[PDB]
Amino acid sequence: GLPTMLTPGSNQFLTSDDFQSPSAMPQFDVTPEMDIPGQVNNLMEIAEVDSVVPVNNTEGKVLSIESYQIPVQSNSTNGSQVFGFPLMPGASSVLNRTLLGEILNYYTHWSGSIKLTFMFCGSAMATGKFLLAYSPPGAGAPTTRKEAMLGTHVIWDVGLQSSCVLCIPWISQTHYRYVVVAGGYITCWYQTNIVVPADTQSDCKILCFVSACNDFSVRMLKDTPFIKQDNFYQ
Amino acid sequence: GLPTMLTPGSNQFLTSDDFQSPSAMPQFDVTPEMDIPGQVNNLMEIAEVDSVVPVNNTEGKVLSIESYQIPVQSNSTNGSQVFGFPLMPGASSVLNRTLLGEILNYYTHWSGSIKLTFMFCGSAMATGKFLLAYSPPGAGAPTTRKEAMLGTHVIWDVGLQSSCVLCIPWISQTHYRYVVVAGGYITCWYQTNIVVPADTQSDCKILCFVSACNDFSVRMLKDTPFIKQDNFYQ
Amino acid sequence: RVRSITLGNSTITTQECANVVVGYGVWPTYLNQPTQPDVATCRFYTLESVMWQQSSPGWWWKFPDALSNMGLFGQNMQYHYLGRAGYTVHVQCNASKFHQGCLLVVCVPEAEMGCATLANKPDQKSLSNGETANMFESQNSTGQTAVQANVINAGMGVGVGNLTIFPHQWINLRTNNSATIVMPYINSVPMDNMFRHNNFTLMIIPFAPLSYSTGATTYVPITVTVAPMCAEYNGLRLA
Amino acid sequence: NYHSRSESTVENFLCRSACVFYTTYRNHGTDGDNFGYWVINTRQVAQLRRKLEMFTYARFDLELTFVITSTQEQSTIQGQDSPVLTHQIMYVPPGGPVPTKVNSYSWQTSTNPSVFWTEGSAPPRMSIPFISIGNAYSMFYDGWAKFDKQGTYGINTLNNMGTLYMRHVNDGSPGPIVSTVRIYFKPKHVKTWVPRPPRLCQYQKAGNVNFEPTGVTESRTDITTMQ
Amino acid sequence: NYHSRSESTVENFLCRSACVFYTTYRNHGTDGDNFGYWVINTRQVAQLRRKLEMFTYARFDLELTFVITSTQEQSTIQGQDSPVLTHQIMYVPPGGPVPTKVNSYSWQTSTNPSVFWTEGSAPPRMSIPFISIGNAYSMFYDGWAKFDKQGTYGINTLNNMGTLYMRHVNDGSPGPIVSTVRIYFKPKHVKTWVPRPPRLCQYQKAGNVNFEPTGVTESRTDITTMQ
């Protein structure tokens, strides 16, 4: 009796709609929820967690646990570069498969600060200094110890502390940037050689961690570029 | 369950409807608006702006900037006509491609007062008088200086002021008139010759401006008769 | 009378009765990585004067490229990745009372200019020579990668008489000799790479040709002086 | 201020309607194999399986939309003039009778939910509640259904969500007609616990977590290189 | 009093539903080129392009209505009796997977919006929000995407609004069927900045502002003439 119009867009199945669906099993009582520990309500909780960064991405090492270990040579030229990777959490293969990068690859846009932690895994008696230098996007990676020092850097003294947390700021012209392919660079430099009670043989290692800060967000959900299937698995 | 009728006009796509459209990208956060200078909310703001009128529309001059320059002869018969064009902002080619005429050609009906500014671009020591005469629609353009003076006119004295603003009133039998093809006439007359310190060679120029007044409106939007395409540009 | 204006170590002379056109009614401000300001760049950069002749078409400058080599603010364009600035353009004109002519001094935001060859893009040199002005022509331009700099279309495919829609000023030599335009930062993003984006261009197009009495100076100098305002940049902190 | 984390939430992350299965069933056949079926699983589509297996326990309602389209086949039958085609999508709850023939007694569906849809209308839709004697679906089970059998590792009967069955109510014409169902899956009211690392190695079997070992990431030339 | 300026407003001036694209796609084909596509552009229809380019920056939502009509072709196939035809209009957001074949994996549209429409109903409709990492679409860009390349002048990736894809879900009959989509475009919630002169010279290319120089207006015989 009540008049009604066609309202174009009816009798259509828009995949991204929020219409109520009739219940195939009404008058059926579901079991009550149980207080399971670990309630997660947002993927950033996963992205806020430190994950070990594989920086030793050289050929032949990605299949071993040595990909996570940054080698610190017992003797090397002062001002040599210990390591270096670009600040592309969703693009650069160093940070791509981390928890942060895994979350990022599920989305198209992202924004926020990257939290990097470098931990020295050498002896308690070992001492030494490192230049953890950060290059802003567009600047280009430094080529010497002096160029790294003249920019943003910290003197990470191994003897004083075995860890160094470095918060990478958000520098972009837009509110969000694309996850896919500037971002910046992290380079470490031998300020001083590692000094030990002069009797050791093997070399020290540095472990890297990546995390998101509290201002991290992702906008446009998409399919991750990592899992692939030819058809149904069964 | 609730009864409903056919209500003729349903399941139709009326192009000029205001029905809500389902969002293909819901749960997507658009970037916030930025305070960009130049917020325009109405085309009359464009139409209220003075635009230089090409009055020197003689053949061979429309491709040069001389089409905007009204030549004022160093010596000519007193009572000669400096220039003259009809008051057809959307029809006459003199006013057709101005900002006002460009806005008008996007509509079918219009109403309001035309604001005309004439600026003398001669020397500061130059002096002289002009008859800026306005003919109401249906009267016909005057043929002599006396006929122009016996009607609506101003004595624009070059020495006293280098600009003259002339507000053309709204004279029509209807609230709106069609943009397409009476309107009136503007004619300028040599009241006196231009007088200079008797040593100059080149002649002076007059620049004309057209604008809409605060009571200007346009009713029926249509396609402009100026841009044309055979098909899609790509 | 005479008004003296000093910014940094630069001083210019302006009339008391000088009309100032403030962009779109907006005075340049900051966006209130933390952006870093540079007040040392707030100086008067007087470009080389251009000689206005009886047969001279207009000129244009694209100001991110124009001040690209002007000491400070040029070093800052080269140095900082992101930059933002409003500009005070002051166009002077030195003429006697025996000189004629009218000028349209207009600043055009996003003046994307076409090419002489339709299936081509203008090159960097043709679009902006920097501190050197690029001149219009009274006829069609010919070139594989040259800007279509015919005066009537203002290089933009529009009517040159309709250019008054942009923040403009009229210099009638019998009435005025100067033009002050205060252009805020106009863009679709809060801050942009300055080395590859000209936010606006200044067009000085003589609508009435220059004229002069016998014995008077043939050319009339047109001087453009630009003062960046509220310039701020990217900022390099945290590591 | 802080940027909104709205679409990063587990509800927005997981409640996305995706196609998880499509099958074709005939209108005529030699045996009674003229029906399509699908045991409701979340481990057959890699994208959805990875997204769900990023958590250990989940609890959600199944919203299913069926996109059924029919095609007339080849030739040799004239004057087809088939009337409109009606489809039955029968849902079999866990422990319910499972058909083996197109005209089985189970299709009479005394207690199996069933939706009858006529072609030309909006696609049929039904919602399955959280059906488990347990308190949550477990994407991972470090245990045996029966400790005696080695092959029962990782299998528990608490994740069985039922089976969907599709068929033609009427043939319409004496000529061949084949229909595709194209089930679209959408979890609703999702609660997830104990987050897990994303699956790195490619999946091999739907009922296994077996994997060929893979590198942690892609390699580069040097530890100091930038491109 | 003052006459009303209601329909002169930018909203009324620009929010007018116009056809911006039409394409035909087959139901059968040799390759998989049985689909229509359209990169969403505002610079292909001269009237709409001129109206939008009268401003420098714009910010609007895209309302799209699709008018899909199917026609049976020629002959040599008998007993066609095709069932109703279903169409899929998949929208690909910027940066999303782009199909190359009629049966590409992108059509499974894990995150690409897609509308399935059966013929005989009201035309399908979908609305695209303002999608740009920038704060407004820029109809004019006096700059280079990459300053090194000359050919990048006037191109910025902030105006990319995605691509529309159209195809047949079902063939219906073994005979030829060709469908035209006829997309109708309508901006909503339009805010415009920095007004510009109307384009005088005729457009040449969609991705260029190049122009053959044209006279400022039409000529007349004399500066004092009246007709």
Numbering used by the authors:
A (entry chain 3), B (entry chain 3): 1 to 181, 186 to 238
C (entry chain 2): 12 to 43, 52 to 258
D (entry chain 1), E (entry chain 1): 55 to 281
Q: What do the study's own words say?
A:
Coxsackie virus B5 (CVB5) is a member of Enterovirus-B (EV-B) species, which can cause various human diseases, such as viral encephalitis; herpangina; hand, foot, and mouth disease (HFMD); aseptic meningitis; and acute flaccid paralysis (1–3). Similar to other EV-B species, CVB5 is a nonenveloped, positive-sense single-strand RNA (+ssRNA) virus. P2, and P3 will break down into nonstructural proteins responsible for genome replication, whereas P1 is the precursor form of structural proteins VP1-VP4, which could be packaged into an icosahedral capsid. Here, we determined the atomic structures of CVB5 in three forms: mature full (F) particle (2.73 Å), intermediate altered (A) particle (2.81 Å), and procapsid empty (E) particle (2.95 Å).
The samples corresponding to both the bands were pooled and mixed for analysis by analytical ultracentrifugation (AUC), which suggested two types of particles–one containing RNA and the other lacking RNA with sedimentation coefficients of 143S and 80S, respectively. Compared with the map of the F particle, both maps of A and E particles had an expansion of ~4% with large openings on the 2-fold axes. The procapsid E particle and uncoating intermediate A particle of CVB5 were structurally almost indistinguishable, each with an expansion of ~4% in capsid radius, compared with the compact mature F particle, which is different from E3 and E30, whose procapsid E particles were comparable to the F particle but smaller than the A particle. However, no empty particle with a smaller radius was found after several rounds of 3D no-alignment classifications using different batches of particles, which is just like E18, CVB1 (13, 20). This is different from what has been found in the cases of E3, E30, E6, and E11, where an empty particle with a similar radius to the compacted F particle could be observed. We noted that the first seven residues of VP1 visualized on A particle would traverse the capsid and stop on the surface of the capsid, which was distinctive from the E particle where the corresponding residues were disordered, and all the other remaining residues were present on the interior of the capsid. But by analogy with other enteroviruses, the presence of pocket factor and myristoylistic acid in the mature F particle but not immature E particle and intermediate A particle, suggests that both the two molecules play important roles in the stabilization and integrity of mature virions for most of the EV-Bs.
